[PDB]
């Protein structure tokens, strides 16, 4: 029971690190391929409690990410210890996001979150706050065979593509803002995405969707 819960928490942590790396922040192969023995040596008590308070971390952009996106900011995460979501437990996080001046904020809860946060999360521009669930990140979705390689496409490339095909942002195929892929990519609406489909009759061919 406890070992299963720890394994699930671990897998969620691995998915979070992989999603940050895919988004484009400096992440190594360590803290992603963290073994069970190391996890139980580090993130465990005298009996093996999750102690998720120290699981939080920051994400800074890579040099390549800065070159591609000059406006890419910092990221913050926090894992709630309590089973539910506390109103003040989210107020402290939301004030800390602006206190440390983080451009993006990622939040993870255990089971459910009070509807008031839904009304309150999009309140501090230009900072963006997103929320995820521990049991919804047990396994990554980008590793699935049907899911192609989604890669965010830069503003310069977006202008180049629109000029090449003589298009508008509205005329592209549209991808919703609630898919597990767009949430995984942290794709702000208005940004064109790039998809590498493994077509059966053409091998590799690229298609572009826009989140809107």
């Amino acid at each position: 029971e406890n070992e299963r819960n720890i394994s699930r928490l671990w897998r969620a942590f691995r998915t979070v690190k992989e999603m940050v790396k895919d988004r484009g922040y400096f992440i190594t192969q360590e803290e992603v391929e963290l073994p069970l023995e190391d996890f139980k040596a580090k993130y465990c008590d005298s009996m093996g409690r999750p102690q998720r308070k120290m699981m939080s971390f920051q994400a800074n952009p890579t040099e390549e990410s800065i070159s591609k996106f000059p406006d890419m900011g910092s990221l913050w995460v926090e894992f709630c210890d309590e089973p539910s979501v506390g109103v003040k437990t989210m107020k402290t996080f939301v004030i800390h996001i602006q206190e440390k001046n983080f451009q993006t904020g990622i939040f993870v809860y255990q089971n459910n979150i009070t509807p008031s946060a839904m009304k309150l999360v999009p309140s501090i521009p230009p900072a963006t706050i997103e929320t995820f669930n521990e049991a919804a990140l047990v396994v990554n979705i980008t590793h699935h065979e049907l899911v192609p390689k989604h890669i965010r496409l830069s503003s310069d490339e977006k202008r180049e593509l629109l000029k090449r095909y003589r298009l508008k942002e509205s005329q592209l195929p549209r991808i919703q803002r609630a898919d597990p892929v767009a949430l995984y990519l942290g794709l702000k609406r208005g940004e064109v995405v790039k998809i590498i489909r493994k077509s059966e009759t053409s091998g590799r061919y690229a298609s572009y969707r826009i989140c809107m």
């Binding site: 508008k168 509205s170 005329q171 549209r174 809107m212």
Partner: protein
Amino acid sequence: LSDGRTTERGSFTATVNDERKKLVHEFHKKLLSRGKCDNCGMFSPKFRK
């Protein structure tokens, strides 16, 4: 308009039509939602069919 992103005639495509329908339907549904008029307080009786 200035940078050519949309001519003065407006851009009516499938996605803007979708958003128009969603927003208008939700806005009408919210109109039909409550019963007390929070503009003057003097609420009025609804109509049946």
